[PDB]
């Protein structure tokens, strides 16, 4: 079934709002890229301050995030994140010009620490043709991660169906979990009916949308319950 | 977002709660669909009395669904077309539903449709397949032939067996929407196809069907919730 993720970007009242939606949350995603000079120590201090799996995500500015870290400092942060026991899922970004081996090295390491890995790719500018979508999913699942995630910006209805078709076909073949997101309200359907098409994770918000098209996890939960 | 119209399907008998249930949902109903195939020997006079018995807040759609298309209507193909054709004399009707299928007398069908339209009636040509969902190309072809009669709406309901069947139905309707100068209604039945009913407006659909009490077709939900769903997308 589809798990509902609540995306947060902290730095108490937020704990007030979380426990409020505790029944709508299967996964809490602690975005950390919004802190300057983040350390695993700081992260670990935040987590210990928090029924749902815990996902830790560092989104590079080069992918819609606010994170300003080199490929090396970023990669090492991902690897170090593995030490925190309270972390169940870690998000590592993908991009063709990536140092494959190194990535595969960092991923196997995270899994060695029993962390669920989510290889992700974002494109806030447009939605690649179906074949390219299916392809990007392919490259990302080559590192045999727990989840493959692909968020893309639609410009028309077909961009939405294409994202849906790609994820659907994928969930029908691969032994890997898939996460497809067509951003904006135009793509809201990808978020609410994610389970219908084989999707394993759907992201909502805890107040204000953390990404284009997200709705409150309380509503998102109600929706996922319908389909 | 979107401008889809929510339709409420009812299948009453010749003979109050109902009329009250309808008024309790007046803000969720853009169109009231009065099915009439559930009437043994239903007559145009009987229907007209029911229509009068029903407001000004919504359009009136009368639909005789033949058994060969998942309905209860057992009327011959001739008693059918004469019934469909005589529904034009009823002033209270805004929309009429006429069925389409491969083995149709094209000429005869066009005559009835032109007739209904000349009587100021919007026509909804529909096709139902409760068995499966033809391939994408097939779906599009079905929409292509139905719009050949130049109705106000083309409606195609199919039964999915997988995710692709749902995507094809959605694709066919969306492509029809970007090109044809005619309103389309695409429905992928059962729970598997529910997304087609709720996000109907996102992909070009003009109508989405719901119920007041129990589902009148596989996949329907209350019009109040459907209304809320259409408002969300």
Swiss-Prot record, chain A:
> Disulphide bridges in this chain?
none
Q: Which InterPro entries match?
A: Aldolase_TIM, DHquinase_I, Type-I_3-dehydroquinase
Position of the signal peptide:
none
Q: Where is the active site?
A: 122, 149
Which positions bind 3-dehydroquinate?
Answer: 29-31, 59, 191, 214
The UniProt catalytic activity note for this protein reads: 3-dehydroquinate = 3-dehydroshikimate + H2O
Q: Write the Enzyme Commission number(s) for this entry.
A: 4.2.1.10
Q: In which pathway does it act?
A: Metabolic intermediate biosynthesis; chorismate biosynthesis; chorismate from D-erythrose 4-phosphate and phosphoenolpyruvate: step 3/7
Kindly indicate whether the keyword Hydrolase belongs to this entry: no
Pfam families listed in its UniProt record: DHquinase_I
Please indicate if the UniProt record lists Repressor as a keyword: no
Q: Which GO terms describe its biological process?
A: 3,4-dihydroxybenzoate biosynthetic process; amino acid biosynthetic process; aromatic amino acid family biosynthetic process; chorismate biosynthetic process
Select a single GO molecular function from the record's annotations and give it. 3-dehydroquinate dehydratase activity
Which UniProt keywords are present, listed alphabetically?
Amino-acid biosynthesis, Aromatic amino acid biosynthesis, Lyase, Schiff base
Domain of life of the source? Bacteria
Where are the coiled-coil regions? Answer: none
* Assembly description: Homodimer.
What PANTHER family does the annotation carry? 3-DEHYDROQUINATE DEHYDRATASE (PTHR43699:SF1)
Q: Which family does it belong to?
A: Belongs to the type-I 3-dehydroquinase family.
Its function, per the record, reads: Involved in the third step of the chorismate pathway, which leads to the biosynthesis of aromatic amino acids. Catalyzes the cis-dehydration of 3-dehydroquinate (DHQ) and introduces the first double bond of the aromatic ring to yield 3-dehydroshikimate.
Give the protein name, as stated in the record: 3-dehydroquinate dehydratase
